[PDB]
Design a protein around this ligand. Structure first.
Ligand SMILES: O=c1[nH]cnc2c([C@@H]3O[C@H](CO)[C@@H](O)[C@H]3O)c[nH]c12
Ligand SMILES: [Zn+2]
Length: 349
């Protein structure tokens, strides 16, 4: 029985962490690019994980399959279309999906990701391709889907271009910029490309989210908020380690994009402490529940909703509350945000 069988909102899910294994196999074969396995089941076992790794050890899983998607236009549109297909099945009415356009390009991107041969797919092309597959997905399945473009921590030289792509594709479908990748890279929040991207975003009214406090110190969160000027924090669990900062963000009504299942598997949460999400619920924080990389974690949104119901006693009422909070914190323009809120209340009566 599904933990919560009513419309849900999802803010934090990576397109390139949410690809069908069957579709990765399909493209490895069509293109003749290697894969670490040859049937769907063995691919799941290898790419997927059921025991905690460190964050760099988790991020390496992408290496297995990205090469089979990157630089292939049919593949990029197709994963975006099937993304909407999946989320529609899970009873999501609105979802913001994030990716790095540079990590899927094979032209005008330096350093060339994945040791690719120069092709014709620029980062600008990737966005348009993903827009296309999402819009087709919307027309087919009738849920609302927007996109978030990721700066990557290790590559601040892409960040100004990420910001320009957010400006160019604003609300079609790109609603925000994000900062993702290896949180453990010393001082990465302050690399000049990242700081200046986020400054340009403030100055041009481009929405902002930042992965912080997944494995880092509370200081990485404080940097997301006070220097980068984020409006939402991805994860944020390790914020509680700093009491004054947690309380400031509570008072200022910061949104935390919690990914509970993600949390165990990246070793961000110790299974024999209280998940920070329990504290968020008792404090009536502003947070959402998110699958983060469902392909790698072998999960669906119900996975995270089951985890919190079974292991943390989340009620139907708390589920409705945090989705209402997720809607309020979405990056939709005002009239679409009101429309979403109207729908959630109607459906929750
Ligand atoms: O758990 C995570 N923490 C930090 N970054 C990532 C991404 C990174 O964002 C890029 C675009 O989605 C992915 O390619 C991955 O490197 C995936 N999952 C996580
Ligand atoms: Zn993430």
């Amino acid at each position: 029985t599904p933990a919560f069988n009513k419309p849900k909102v999802e803010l934090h899910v990576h397109l390139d962490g949410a690809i069908k294994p069957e579709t990765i196999l399909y493209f490895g074969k069509k293109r003749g690019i290697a894969l670490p396995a040859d049937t769907v089941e063995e691919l799941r076992n290898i790419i997927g994980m059921d025991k905690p790794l460190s964050l760099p050890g988790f991020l390496a899983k992408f290496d297995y399959y990205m090469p089979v998607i990157a630089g292939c236009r049919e593949a990029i549109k197709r994963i975006a279309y099937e993304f909407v297909e999946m989320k529609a099945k899970e009873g999501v009415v609105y979802v913001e999906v994030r990716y790095s356009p540079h990590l899927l390009a094979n032209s005008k991107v330096d350093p060339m990701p994945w040791n690719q041969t120069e092709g014709d797919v620029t980062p600008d092309d990737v966005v348009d391709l993903v827009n296309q597959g999402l819009q087709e997905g919307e027309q087919a399945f009738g849920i609302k889907v927007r996109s978030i473009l990721c700066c990557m921590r290790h590559q601040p030289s892409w960040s100004l271009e990420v910001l320009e792509l957010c400006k160019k594709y604003n609300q079609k479908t790109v609603v925000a910029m994000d900062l993702a990748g290896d949180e453990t890279i010393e001082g990465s929040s302050l690399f000049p490309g990242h700081v200046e991207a986020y400054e340009g975003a403030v100055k041009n009214g481009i929405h902002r989210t930042v992965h912080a406090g997944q494995v880092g110190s509370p200081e990485v969160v404080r940097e997301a908020v006070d220097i980068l000027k984020t409006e939402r924090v991805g994860h944020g669990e390790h914020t509680i380690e700093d009491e004054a900062l947690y309380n400031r963000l509570l008072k200022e009504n910061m949104h935390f994009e919690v990914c509970p299942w993600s949390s165990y598997l990246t070793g961000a949460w110790d299974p024999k402490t209280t998940h920070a999400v329990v504290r968020f619920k008792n404090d009536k924080a502003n947070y959402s529940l998110n699958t983060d990389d469902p392909l790698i974690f072998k999960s669906t949104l119900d996975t995270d909703y089951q985890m919190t119901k079974k292991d943390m006693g989340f009620t139907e009422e708390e589920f409705k509350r945090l989705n209402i909070n997720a809607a309020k914190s979405s990056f939709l323009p005002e009239e679409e945000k009101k429309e979403l809120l109207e729908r959630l209340y109607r459906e929750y009566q």
